[PDB]
Design a protein around this nucleic acid. Structure first.
Ligand SMILES: [Ca+2]
Ligand SMILES: [Ca+2]
Ligand SMILES: [Zn+2]
Ligand SMILES: [Zn+2]
Ligand SMILES: [Zn+2]
Ligand SMILES: [Zn+2]
Lengths: 68, 548, 344, 547, 345
DNA sequence: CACAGTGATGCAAA
DNA sequence: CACAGTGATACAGCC
DNA sequence: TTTGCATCACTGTG
DNA sequence: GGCTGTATCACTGTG
C-alpha cells in the first residue's frame, strides 16, 4: 500500500472488491493495477473497471469512463 | 478414583497441553497423597481406542484400489510422491488418515448416540438393516501460517485442511426411512473431523492435485459398497452418500474446472453470462454437474466442431480445465453473507455521496465519503473500520438500525425510503438461506420468497441502476435465483455451510502453537491427532455428564 | 560458452520445471506452463522472445482447425521434416499421465505473429502405455521416416495400485517402440541388450541411428554410464531394429542437448549423483558410423549456480540453452527463479 | 480436599481460563461425588489476599503528593485526565496500580523467601534492620494489538507496558551488608510484575508523559523515605533503590530527551559523535546523567551565550527535550545482540560480493548477493529469511559454523582468516556482557577484554575499512568502549536486560484473548490482575510441591 | 463566507489541536507542533504557505539572540504594536504548564525566508499562576499600553495534589491581571462582577476596553451566555479597572475569532453543549461605547463537519479561518485530520 | 549466556 | 439465523 | 508389572 | 445462615 492504497471505488460501477478481487489482466501480481486520468484534478481508477483488454493495458503501460 | 478415559476427556476438552496436565497431576498427587489423576502414559494408552485403525471392519464388495488392512493410522500425505532430484520439486509436508478408517472410527464413536436414537424412535435395538450415512466434506485454504526453522522442504506459508462431518443417518424399517441421528449443531467446531492437513498453497494446482488425489480415489471407490462393522454386539451394515458442499467459491472454481473467478460466466450453479443475469435477475435453473463439466472439458480439448477461441468458449461455457473433485452445486451461507455485506457497504458509500444526482466523482470526495461513513458507523453502531469483511461486521451491518443511522448522511428522503425498503427485503430474505430447517422454523418466510426476490430485483434495477446495469454480483445472483430450488433439493442451506471448517481453522491455528511438537516433520501429525481426539463425541459426552 | 542473466517480466510464474522450447524458423516458442491456461492466453503456447538480455512471453493463438492441448510437464518432443514438433506423453496439471500424440505446426505467420495448428493422433497396435520422462526421435532410412521411442517413468498398473502409494512411480519396460505417423501404427520390439529401464536420458538422432546416453534406473537407483546405439533398417517388409552397447559413455540424468553444428552436439547440465551436479559440459562428435565424446571447457559458473541444489532448462535450437535456478527466497515475492542463458 | 489457594495456583499456572476450570470442577464433582476442586467464588475470595491493596503499611515520612490510604487496587491510568470536548483529545485506555501498594504486595508475597534467605546466612528471623531492596524497571512498546469494536475512545493499535522486578534485598548486619534474597532467573517471565497497562503509541510523547507522570512522581516520592511493614508478626523497615534498565534504545532516547533515531550523537552514555567514535573506537568514558541532561535542556532553551543553531547543538550535545524519567546509563543485552547480529549479517552480504575490491555496486547485484546468502544459509545452518532479526536467529548466526558455511562463498582465502578472526573475537567478547555474574562465571574472559576489544577495533579499522571508516554503529561503539566499566559499576549486564519484559509481552498477548473479558472497559484491568496473579511466588511455589 | 478543503504534505502529523497561527505583514506562521522539535526544524516555528489550495509547512530559523521556546499546546497569544507577538502560558509536550512570557518579533526577512527573534520576559509582583486556555489582550489608554489577562485552567496546588488525580484540571480564580511589558511587572485586581472562573472564551481588544464573551466553568459544568466589558484607565497614578455586564451575550467554548474589516469581528466554531457544535456564526460590531451581536448566514458545511464530534482551528489574521476535523480513523497513515479554510468575505 | 514449554521414546526405579 | 467461550455480578435455592 | 524423568530438535516475545 | 449454582452483560476469533 504505502501511499498507493488501491482499495478505492474507481467508478459508480466499480466491480472491484477487496474480498473477491481476482487477477483479470496478466500483470496484477498481488494487487490490482490502476490507470491515472488527468481530467480535472486527475484520479486513479481500476484497470478492470475500464473494460479494457490485456493488450490495451500493456500498450498504455487520460479520460475515464465518466470523463470521456 | 478417576478413569483414564475421563482424564483424557478433561485434558483434551479443557485445552490443556501434556506438560500442563503433567504439572497438574504431579501437584495434585504430591499434595493430596492419592492418585486422583491418571498418569500421562496411561492417558496415551487409553487414547488409542478412539483413534483410527483400531476396530475391525469389512467392505462388501472389497474396495477397488484400496488395501484391505484395518490397522492403518496417520500416514504421509504425499502418498509416495517422488522426491528425487530429477523429477518435479516437492516442497510440502502433509499428513492424512485413510478415509474408510476415519469413517469407521467416527461410526464407532457415534455408536452410543446411534443406539440411543434408535431406541428413541421406538425401534428394536438389534436390526442390521442397511443404514445410510451422510457426510459433508469441507476443504479450506488458510493464510499467514508461518514456516519453521530446520531441515526439510522449503514449505510455503499457507495450509490446506480437508475435513468431514457426519450429518444424518437413516434406516429402512418399512416404506419410509426413519432418521436415527442428526447433528444438533452442524456448523459447530465440535463436529468437524480432520482428514488431511497439508502445507501448500491453495492455488498451487499441481501440488493440490498430487496430495488430494488418493482421497478422491478412495471416496469414488467406496461410493458403491457396503461396510460391515460390529456395533453393540451384532454386525451392522452401513452405506455412504457423500455430499461435498463446504468449499468456498474460489476453490469450487478451481476444483470444478471452471475459469477464473472473474469472467463473463459468474455462477457455479447455472451457465448464464453476467449481462443476462443483470437483465433477468429472477428466473434461472440449476443445470451444472461434475459429469457435465467433464464432458465440457473433453469438448474443449478435442474441438469437435472446429471453432475459433471465442466460439469454443461460448460452446463450453466457462470450463477450460478438467475437474478432479465432485462437488454438489451449493451456496455457501457464510461467504454469501460476507459478499452481500460488502455490497451493501459499497451501496451505502455511493448513496451518501449523491451518485444519482450530480455524480462529479472527485479523487478527494471518494475518500471523504468513506471517511464520513466509517466515522458515523463508529459513533452510532459501534463498528470499527476493517480492511476486509468478516461475519460479525456483516451481522451488525445488515441490521435496520445501520440503515437508520446511515440515512442521516443522505440529504434526500426518497433515497431513505428506497434504502430502507431494500434493507427490509434483504432482512426478510436472509432467514431462508441461513436456518437449519426453513420448512419448520420460518415457514412464512420460506413461502414468501419469490415475491420478495422479485421486488428486490425490481428495486435494484429501478432505483439503483447507477451501479447495476449489466453487472450483478455472483452472490446476489445466487441468492435471488437458486434459493428455492436448492432448498427443495437438499432440505436446508446453511446446515451445509463452511462455518464448521472455518472454526476448525482456528482450532488448527491454536493447536499448532500450543498443543504440538515444534519440529517440522511432526507438527502436522500431532495437530491432526489432537484435532481428531478433540472432535470425539465419546470424550465430549463426559464433559456433559453432570446433567442427565 | 558465454553465460548471461535474463530478467523475466510479468509472466515469470508461468515458467515451471519441465517446460518445452520449440524452434520455428528462427523463433522460439514456450509450451508447458504452470497450471491450467488463464483467460489471457487460453491456448497455452507462448512466444519466447529474448532480446538485449530481456525475456518476454506473448500469447499465441491457435488455428480454427486445431485441438487445444493441455499443459504437459515432461513431454517427449522431437522435430520432424513442412516442419513439425511431435510431442508424446507428459503429465497434466491434475497429475494424470496422458497417452496422446500431438503434432504441432504453423498455419500462417503474420507480421511478428504466428498461428499454430495442433492435431491429435491416435496410435494403434502395441500402443505405448502412458509415461513421462522418455525420449522419442525420428529415423530416416531408404526414403521412409519412422520414430523411435524409449522408456521412462509410469504409475503402477491399475491391478497393483494402492491409495497408500498412489503417486509412486516405476520404470517402464526397456522395450523399443517404432511409430509410423503416416498411418499412426506402433510396433514394440524387445531387444536382449536392454534389461534395465532408463529415465531422464539423452537421445541423439543421426541419419539412420539413435544414440542413447545417460539415464537413471529407478529399480537399482544407479546412473549407469552406458552408451546405446539403436539402428533401424526399413526394407519393403517388416522393419528391423538392432541395439549395440558401445564404450566411452558418460553418466548423466535430465541433461540438456543443443546442436551447435552439423555432426556435433553439446551436452550441458544434469546430475551425476543425488546432490552432486554435473558441472562439466560434453562435446559429442558424430560420424557416418563412428561417434566420440570429449570434455570441453567448463564455463565460468556464477556463485548461485555452483551452490544450487536443483536446476532445469531447455534448448532454444540456436546453439543456446535456457536454464534456471530456484530463488528459494519467497516472502510473498513473485521472483522465484533466476533464469540464465548459455551460448555454446 | 485441595485448598482454595492450591486450586487457584493450579488454575493460574496451568493457563486455565475461568470457564475451563468451571467445566473441569463440574465434571470432577459429578463423576467422583466429592468436591476435590474448590468453586470459582472460593478461588476469587482466596485470591484477594494476593492482589495489591490488602496489607497495611506505613510511610515515614509520609510520601509527598501520595495518598495515605492502604486499600487502593486497580486504578484508572488516565489519573483523571480531562475528557471534555474543549480539552485535548483522549484516545487511550489505561489501568495501573499504585507504586507503593504494588511494592508492598511484592515484598509481602516473598516473606517465606526472605525468611529462608535470612536463615541461610545465620541471622535471627526477628531482625528489624533496614532492608535495602533494588527494583529493576522496564518499559516496552508493543505493536500490532488489535482494536475491539464498541463505543468509546478510538484507541490505537499499539500498547505500552510498564513493569518491575525485585532484584535483590540486602540487610546491614553489624558493619557489613549480606544478601537475603537474589533472583536466580532475573530474565525469566515469572518475575515481571506489571504496574501500568495502556493502549498508546510508544512515540506519542504527549500521551506517554500524561499517563506515566504519576508513576514517576510516586517513584520520586518513594526514593527518599522508608516503608514500615509487618512480616511474621514483626515490624520491618524497607528502603528502595530504583534502577530503570529495561528500556530499549529508541525509548531511552525519546524519554531521556536526546535527539531521536540516528544523529551526530549516537551513544546514550558518553558525548562522542559518530566521527570521533570511528576515529578512536577504544577509549571513552561515561558522562551522561539525568541531572546533566536537565541542565543541558535548560541551557538549550535559555541560550545564554547567544549562539546559532549549530553552535547551540554542539554545546548541548544533542539534547533538545526535557527528560522526565531517570534511566540509569546501561546497555540492553538483547537489543545489543540483535544489532550486532544484523551488522554481521550485512558484513557477510558485503564480503560475499567482494566490496573491498569493488568500490561500487548496483541495487540488483546487492539484492542478488542477499538472495544468495539467504539461500545458502538454509542448506547448512537450517535457517530461513526473516524480515526483522530476532534473538534465536542471532544466537544461531553468531556461531562459528555460520562463518564456516559463509566461508565457501568468498572467492579469496585472504578474507576467510579475517572473517574468522572477527567472529572469534566477537564470540570471546559476548559471554562477558551476556553472563549474569561474569566475575564468578567467566573470570578468564572478563580479565582479558580490553585486549580483545583493541584487536577487534584494529581489525575493523584495517581490514573492514570500506564500511567502518568514519561510521561505527552505536551498539558496536557501546560494546567496544562502554562495557569494561558497567560491569565494575553495577555487577552484570545480562541480569539488567529487557528479556523479562519481552517474554512477558507473550503472556500479555495470551491473556488478552484467553483470560480477560472481551470489552474496551474491562480488558486492561482483567489482564493486569491475571498477570499479577501469574507473577506471584506464593502461588508459584505450590507447583513445585513435589521437590 | 466560503469553505474550501486544503491538503497537507508529508508533515501533516506536525499539526495538533491548539496550534497557534501568527501573522507578520501578510505572512502566516505556525507554532505549537506535536512532540518535541526534530532535526528538520529545531526552532519549532514554521512558515504556513498556502498556494492553489495546497498547504506547505516550511522550516524557519531563529535569530542569534533568540531563546528556543518549547512547543505550547494552548497558549494565550496577543499582538503588540515593530510588530510583535506575546505568548503566555500553555502546556509543554511533557504535559507540564509554563509560566513564562515569550516575545516574538521579525529580525530580518529575505526571499522566501524569515528570521525570528524570541525573548523571554520574567514577571514580577503578583505573578499569574501557570494556566492554559486563558485570554490576554493589549489595551492602549492615554498614550500608555498594558496587557489584560483573564483566568483559565490549571492543575491543583502543589500542597493539595494527589497521584491518584494527578492530571485533574481546575479553573483558576476570576482575578484580572494587568501586565506592563516595558518593565515586565504585573498587578492583580479583584472585581465584584466576576465570581465564577471561565476558560476557553473569546476576547476582543478595543481602544481602552476588553470584551469577554463565552466561556466554560468547570466547577458548575455550564457554559454561561455572559458578556463582560473590562475598562482600564491609566492615569498618572495606579491604574483603575472596572467591569460591567452587558445583555446580549452568547454561549460558546473554544471559539475562533477573525477580524474581517475595521471595527468588525466574526466568531466561527465552538461548542454549545458537550455533544453539540455551534454551527452558527456570529458578527460583532464595535462602537464608541456599545457593541452589537448579530447572526450571519450559515456557511454551507460539508457532511463530514456537521456530523463530527470535535473540531479545532486557528486564525490566519486575513479574514481566513483554518479549521480541522479528526476525520478518517487511526489506521495505516492515510490522512489523520481533514483541514478546511473558511473565508469570511 | 532467556526461558518455560512440547510431545513421543526409552531406560531406570519401586 | 456460528458457537464455544470471557470474567464479574446478582439472585434463587439447598444443606 | 506401573511410574518417573532425561533427551531431541524446535517454538514465541522480541 | 452461609455455600452453590446459574442467568446476564457486551464482546471475541476463524473466516
Ligand atoms: Ca478460507
Ligand atoms: Ca519491544
Ligand atoms: Zn475499480
Ligand atoms: Zn477520468
Ligand atoms: Zn446461477
Ligand atoms: Zn558511547
Amino acid at each position: 500500500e504505502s501511499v498507493t492504497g488501491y482499495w478505492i471505488t474507481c467508478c459508480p460501477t466499480c466491480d472491484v472488491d477487496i474480498n473477491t478481487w481476482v487477477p483479470f489482466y496478466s500483470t496484477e501480481l498481488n494487487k490490482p493495477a490502476m490507470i491515472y486520468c488527468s481530467h480535472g484534478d486527475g484520479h486513479w481508477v481500476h484497470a478492470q473497471c475500464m473494460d479494457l483488454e490485456e493488450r490495451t493495458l500493456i500498450h498504455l503501460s487520460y479520460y475515464c469512463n465518466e470523463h470521456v | 478414583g478417576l478413569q483414564p478415559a475421563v482424564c483424557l476427556a478433561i485434558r483434551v476438552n479443557t485445552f490443556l497441553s501434556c506438560s500442563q496436565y503433567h504439572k497438574m497431576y504431579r501437584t495434585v498427587k504430591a499434595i493430596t497423597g492419592r492418585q486422583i489423576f491418571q498418569p500421562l502414559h496411561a492417558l496415551r494408552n487409553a487414547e488409542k481406542v478412539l483413534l483410527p485403525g483400531y476396530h475391525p471392519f469389512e467392505w462388501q464388495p472389497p474396495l477397488k484400489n484400496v488395501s484391505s488392512r484395518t490397522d492403518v493410522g496417520i500416514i504421509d500425505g504425499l502418498s509416495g510422491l517422488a522426491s528425487s532430484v530429477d523429477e518435479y520439486p516437492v516442497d510440502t509436508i502433509a499428513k492424512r488418515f485413510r478415509y474408510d478408517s476415519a469413517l469407521v472410527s467416527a461410526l464407532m464413536d457415534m455408536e452410543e448416540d446411534i443406539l440411543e436414537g434408535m431406541r428413541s424412535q421406538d425401534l428394536d435395538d438389534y436390526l442390521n438393516g442397511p443404514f445410510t450415512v451422510v457426510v459433508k466434506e469441507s476443504c479450506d485454504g488458510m493464510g499467514d501460517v508461518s514456516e519453521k526453522h530446520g531441515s526439510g522442504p522449503a514449505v510455503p506459508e499457507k495450509a490446506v485442511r480437508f475435513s468431514f462431518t457426519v450429518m444424518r443417518i437413516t434406516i429402512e424399517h418399512g416404506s419410509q426411512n426413519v432418521k436415527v441421528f442428526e447433528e444438533p449443531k452442524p456448523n459447530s467446531e465440535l463436529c468437524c473431523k480432520p482428514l488431511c492437513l497439508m502445507l501448500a498453497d491453495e492455488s498451487d494446482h499441481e501440488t493440490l492435485t498430487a496430495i488430494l488425489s488418493p482421497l478422491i480415489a478412495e471416496r469414488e471407490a467406496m461410493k458403491s459398497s457396503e461396510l460391515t462393522l460390529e456395533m453393540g454386539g451384532i454386525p451392522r451394515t452401513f452405506k455412504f452418500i457423500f455430499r461435498g458442499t463446504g468449499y468456498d467459491e474460489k476453490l469450487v472454481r478451481e476444483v470444478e474446472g471452471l475459469e477464473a473467478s472473474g469472467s463473463v460466466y459468474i455462477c457455479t450453479l447455472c451457465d448464464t453470462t453476467r449481462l443476462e443475469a443483470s437483465q433477468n435477475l429472477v428466473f434461472h435453473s440449476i443445470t451444472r454437474s461434475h459429469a457435465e463439466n467433464l464432458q465440457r472439458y473433453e469438448v474443449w480439448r478435442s474441438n469437435p466442431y472446429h471453432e475459433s477461441v471465442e466460439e469454443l468458449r461460448d460452446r463450453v461455457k466457462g470450463v477450460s480445465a478438467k475437474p478432479f473433485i465432485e462437488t454438489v452445486p451449493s451456496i455457501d451461507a457464510l461467504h454469501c453473507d460476507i459478499g452481500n455485506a460488502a455490497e451493501f457497504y459499497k451501496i451505502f458509500q455511493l448513496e451518501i455521496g449523491e451518485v444519482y444526482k450530480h455524480p462529479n466523482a472527485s479523487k478527494e470526495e471518494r475518500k471523504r465519503w468513506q471517511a464520513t461513513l466509517d466515522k458515523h458507523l463508529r459513533k452510532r453502531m459501534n463498528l470499527k473500520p476493517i480492511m476486509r469483511m468478516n461475519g460479525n461486521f456483516a451481522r451488525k451491518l445488515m441490521t435496520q438500525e445501520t440503515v437508520d443511522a446511515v440515512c442521516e448522511l443522505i440529504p434526500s428522503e426518497e433515497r431513505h425510503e428506497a434504502l430502507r425498503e431494500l434493507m427490509d427485503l434483504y432482512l426478510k430474505m436472509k432467514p431462508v438461506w441461513r436456518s437449519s430447517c426453513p420448512a419448520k422454523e420460518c415457514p412464512e418466510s420460506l413461502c414468501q420468497y419469490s415475491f420478495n426476490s422479485q421486488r428486490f430485483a425490481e428495486l435494484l434495477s429501478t432505483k439503483f441502476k447507477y451501479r447495476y446495469e449489466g453487472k450483478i454480483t455472483n452472490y446476489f445472483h445466487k441468492t435471488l435465483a437458486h434459493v428455492p430450488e436448492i432448498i427443495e433439493r437438499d432440505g436446508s442451506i446453511g446446515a451445509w455451510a463452511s462455518e464448521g471448517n472455518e472454526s476448525g481453522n482456528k482450532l488448527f491455528r491454536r493447536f499448532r502453537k500450543m498443543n504440538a511438537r515444534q519440529s517440522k516433520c511432526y507438527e502436522m501429525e500431532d495437530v491432526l491427532k489432537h484435532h481428531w481426539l478433540y472432535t470425539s463425541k465419546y470424550l465430549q459426552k463426559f464433559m456433559n455428564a453432570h446433567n442427565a | 560458452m558465454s553465460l548471461q542473466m535474463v530478467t523475466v517480466g510479468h509472466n515469470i510464474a508461468l515458467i515451471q520445471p519441465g517446460f518445452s522450447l520449440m524452434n520455428f524458423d528462427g523463433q522460439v516458442f514456450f509450451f508447458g506452463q504452470k497450471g491450467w491456461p488463464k483467460r489471457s492466453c487460453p491456448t497455452g503456447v507462448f512466444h519466447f522472445d529474448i532480446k538485449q538480455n530481456h525475456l518476454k512471453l506473448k500469447p499465441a493463438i491457435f488455428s480454427k482447425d486445431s485441438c487445444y492441448l493441455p499443459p504437459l510437464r515432461y513431454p517427449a518432443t522431437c522435430s520432424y521434416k513442412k516442419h513439425q514438433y511431435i510431442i508424446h506423453g507428459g503429465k497434466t496439471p491434475n497429475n494424470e499421465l496422458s497417452d496422446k500424440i500431438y503434432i504441432m505446426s504453423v498455419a500462417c505467420k503474420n507480421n511478428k505473429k504466428v498461428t499454430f495448428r495442433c492435431t491429435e493422433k491416435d496410435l494403434v497396435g502395441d500402443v505405448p502405455e502412458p509415461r513421462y520422462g522418455h525420449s522419442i526421435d525420428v529415423v530416416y532410412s531408404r526414403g521412409k521416416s519412422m520414430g523411435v521411442l524409449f522408456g521412462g517413468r509410469s504409475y503402477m498398473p491399475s491391478t497393483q495400485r494402492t491409495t497408500e502409494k498412489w503417486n509412486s512411480v516405476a520404470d517402464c519396460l526397456p522395450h523399443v517402440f517404432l511409430i509410423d505417423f503416416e498411418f499412426g501404427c506402433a510396433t514394440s520390439y524387445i531387444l536382449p541388450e536392454l534389461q534395465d529401464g532408463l529415465s531422464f536420458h539423452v537421445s541423439i538422432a543421426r541419419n539412420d541411428t539413435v544414440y542413447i546416453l545417460g539415464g537413471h534406473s529407478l529399480a537399482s537407483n544407479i546412473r549407469p554410464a552406458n552408451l546405446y546405439r539403436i539402428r533401424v533398417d526399413l526394407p519393403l517388409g517388416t522393419p528391423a531394429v538392432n541395439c549395440t552397447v558401445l564404450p566411452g559413455g558418460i553418466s548423466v540424468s535430465s541433461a540438456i542437448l543443443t546442436q551447435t553444428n552439423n555432426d556435433e552436439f553439446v551436452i550441458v547440465g544434469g546430475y551425476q549423483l543425488e546432490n552432486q551436479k554435473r558441472m562439466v559440459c560434453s562435446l559429442v562428435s558424430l560420424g557416418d558410423n563412428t561417434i566420440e565424446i570429449s570434455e570441453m571447457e567448463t564455463p565460468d559458473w556464477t556463485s548461485d549456480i555452483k551452490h544450487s541444489k536443483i536446476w532445469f532448462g531447455s534448448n532454444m535450437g540456436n546453439g543456446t540453452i535456457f536454464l534456471g535456478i530456484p530463488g528459494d527466497n519467497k516472502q510473498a515475492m513473485s521472483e522465484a527463479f533466476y533464469f540464465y542463458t548459455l551460448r555454446c
